[PDB]
Amino acid sequence: HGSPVDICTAKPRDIPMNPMCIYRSPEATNRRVWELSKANSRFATTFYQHLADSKNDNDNIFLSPLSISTAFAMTKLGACNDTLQQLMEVFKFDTISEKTSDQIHFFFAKLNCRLYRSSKLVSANRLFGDKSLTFNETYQDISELVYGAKLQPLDFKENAEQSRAAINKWVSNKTEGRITDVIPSEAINELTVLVLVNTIYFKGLWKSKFSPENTRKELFYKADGESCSASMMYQEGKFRYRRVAEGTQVLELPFKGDDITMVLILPKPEKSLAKVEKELTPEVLQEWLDELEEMMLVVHMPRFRIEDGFSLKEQLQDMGLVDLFSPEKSKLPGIVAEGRDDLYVSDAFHKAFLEVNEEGSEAAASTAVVIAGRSLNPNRVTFKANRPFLVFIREVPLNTIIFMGRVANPCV
Amino acid sequence: HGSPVDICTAKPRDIPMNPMCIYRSPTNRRVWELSKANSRFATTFYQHLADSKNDNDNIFLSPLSISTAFAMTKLGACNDTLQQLMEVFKFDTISEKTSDQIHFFFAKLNCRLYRSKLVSANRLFGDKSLTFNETYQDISELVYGAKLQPLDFKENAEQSRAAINKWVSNKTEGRITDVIPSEAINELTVLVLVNTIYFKGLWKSKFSPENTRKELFYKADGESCSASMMYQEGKFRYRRVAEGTQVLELPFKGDDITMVLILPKPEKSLAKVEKELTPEVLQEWLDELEEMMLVVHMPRFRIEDGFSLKEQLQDMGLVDLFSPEKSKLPGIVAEGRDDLYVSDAFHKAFLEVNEEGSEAAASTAVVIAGRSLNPNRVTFKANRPFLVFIREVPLNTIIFMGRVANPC
Ligand SMILES: *[C@@H]1O[C@H](CO)[C@@H](O[C@@H]2O[C@H](CO)[C@@H](O[C@H]3O[C@H](CO)[C@@H](O)[C@H](O)[C@@H]3O)[C@H](O)[C@H]2NC(C)=O)[C@H](O)[C@H]1NC(C)=O
Ligand SMILES: *[C@@H]1O[C@H](CO)[C@@H](O[C@@H]2O[C@H](CO)[C@@H](O[C@H]3O[C@H](CO)[C@@H](O)[C@H](O)[C@@H]3O)[C@H](O)[C@H]2NC(C)=O)[C@H](O)[C@H]1NC(C)=O
Ligand SMILES: *[C@@H]1O[C@H](CO)[C@@H](O[C@@H]2O[C@H](CO)[C@@H](O)[C@H](O)[C@H]2NC(C)=O)[C@H](O)[C@H]1NC(C)=O
Ligand SMILES: *[C@@H]1O[C@H](CO)[C@@H](O)[C@H](O)[C@H]1NC(C)=O
Ligand SMILES: *[C@@H]1O[C@H](CO)[C@@H](O)[C@H](O)[C@H]1NC(C)=O
């Protein structure tokens, strides 16, 4: 009698499932799966902000924070010491009050089971290790059981570029031809050892379809004030909506099953999207969603397609002292007379001197922090018009942000 | 009737410390814990600095000085600005609770440090036309002894610049003269927080001029030049650690302040030693250097360095995972290969919205590799570039540190 092992159902009894190292973290569904979605959502918003920071407000942005959280959780499996701790912290997995890092994989397995079990929402993970190497069995086993990531051998040593073409094809296969060149040229060479890959594919139909005979060409105004032609869709009906504080709007468009929805966030005609992006936290997002009431309204949005991509190594390691140097984001309310927070460090310098001779040595140094007050120029476009907005594709019962981004240019 | 409020004496309760905001982070153990944090910023920051420079250029800074100035700047920070500040400077690793308690510990440490000559002076220069918050002003005077001198930025930037620079020059015996560059201050400048640190000690074991000789020094780019090398033999704390690195400690009259020189073995690049550098590693080396009779020979030289902190700090978010040296992934390959690191990682995404619904896709690829090679052009035994640390031993504090890449 043979029975296929399944983590969703229960853990094996003999197959060892313990990572090589362990990090003990500080401090209406499953408490575990819930707290993990909360951590994931915390990485999504935090990462998004940093991402949006390094880009031009005229550029679109689109990513799957869940996808990223998944790939690195998979990579975490073999991490140790400091590498493991940083990973735990960077992805907010350590915000799960008291819990060893190895428990994260199982909660992650419980989440993926609930997510990928109306509207198509699939995911596939895979490991591509070099054929000449011998990979650790427990690692290979945990990866297959927790993330369903089997290890496929490739010849990086002798056939890098062909191996790359292989991994890219696999991913094109798991995303219906949508993601074709995930791994760039020269990214893989004879020194490569293992490539961990995650993919997520989603395609749903509106619970409340739009009718083609109602789409119209209209001018859409970008952040820099320039305009372009856009096809705007139109329909009126009952939709969950809400006009929050400062005038921000939140609109939820659900897909056939109702458990996956698209949430649109538009700032007040006078305020910029950047104001809404910096204020974005997982709690704020939750408050908005919470206080959403259904009502008769006219939904007016552009039909478009956007493709985006970026290096995580680059983005992840550039999260240092950012706010203090930003006129918009800097918060230094304590310095001046009465809360004046337009203060920000315009620049800081350091000078040092060292002399060593027969009698001894002399050393000097000075650090200068230069704070200045400034402002943000007014927004070019103030009149009501089609402007850029935020987009989220959520799984509601699981409180999970699958996709998210900024639709800054839905043209041509 | 009147007793000056002195923090070096006081206990947490006595000193009323209330900053605008607070941050909750996850028994002189504190002063100790603070020095560790500073030391951790020190190494982290150095590695990043060394990284963006040419291995042929010298490097010299005072991490303590930067930590101090930004700690002073932290007094008026809030929300995300305050958290980042707490984290980037590793203050969030101090087993405490509220972000305000570190200014109390930093004061305790500055007390022990500044009472060989080792002094420090901090001052705030605000625009005369503005009104500065009284509490902020009081706390900066109490904790860092930073008084607020008014200057006319709004009307006389260039003159005010000259003023601040002259004060710095005064507190560093004319060593640091142009800390603040031109155009760095203008009509919109509001406040300039300045820290200063000066040190001058004599060797506990002086060097004799009659023994200095010009010797060839080989730089990182291969070429060689002449340097005046000092010579003397005696008992010094030393040690030839793992991977063949040498650590030498030359103390100053008083023993409480010392210079530590770090030299990698011939076939190892200084750059690789810089990249592997961690507070713990540094500690272990220092921890048990044995005293022994040996011939110490080092160059006599001077180096002056300066740089903008914005660029550096803005990107201080590195993760060992992307570091060939520091990455730890012993669980992937059988037996435990240590050299595994993520060479790069990519994300790609797609979204299409139309009348019928929407379609989204995405992939994340993490590429792990091993066998990273650090260029090494001077692999023979000769005078080469080394690391320099000037530390306070009873307070395990790194006051100054740098790279001597060209004493010529
Ligand atoms: C200067 O910055 C100060 C921060 O260091 C800031 O102090 C805060 O001021 C408020 C109001 O004066 C205090 O709140 C008081 O009032 C509330 C309600 O009236 C009481 O419940 C409180 O107990 C308290 O009595 C804050 O406590 C105080 N924060 C501190 C110092 O702990 C000043 O407001 C700033 N002043 C200027 C000129 O802007
Ligand atoms: C593959 O990675 C494994 C981590 O998931 C790692 O597991 C460790 O394997 C060793 C065996 O060498 C276990 O040590 C055992 O042996 C002693 C004496 O026989 C026992 O007393 C111990 O309690 C233990 O059972 C480790 O405990 C085990 N680590 C854990 C926590 O699972 C393998 O070593 C790696 N294998 C290869 C090929 O590198
Ligand atoms: C930044 O943090 C401070 C607290 O450290 C927050 O201050 C509170 O602001 C609200 C207004 O929304 C007031 O009702 C409270 O009285 C404030 N608390 C204090 C200091 O008494 C502030 O809201 C935070 N700002 C952000 C980024 O949301
Ligand atoms: C890394 O952690 C392991 C246990 O997880 C420990 O045995 C080892 O000494 C650590 N490595 C270091 C930092 O020396
Ligand atoms: C620096 O300031 C002191 C007083 O604080 C003054 O006496 C001294 O002359 C100044 N330094 C010099 C010599 O310029």
From Swiss-Prot, chain B:
Effect of mutating Y46C: In AT3D; type-I
Residues the record lists as binding heparin: W32, R112, R123
Tissue specificity as recorded in UniProt: Found in plasma.
Outcome recorded upon mutating A382T: In AT3D; type-II; Oslo/Paris-3
Result when mutating I399T: In AT3D; type-I
Outcome of mutating L387P: In AT3D; type-II
Effect of S169P: In AT3D; type-I
Impact reported for A360Q: Reduces interaction with thrombin by 80%
Function: Most important serine protease inhibitor in plasma that regulates the blood coagulation cascade. AT-III inhibits thrombin, matriptase-3/TMPRSS7, as well as factors IXa, Xa and XIa. Its inhibitory activity is greatly enhanced in the presence of heparin.
Protein name: Antithrombin-III
Organism field: Homo sapiens
Gene: SERPINC1
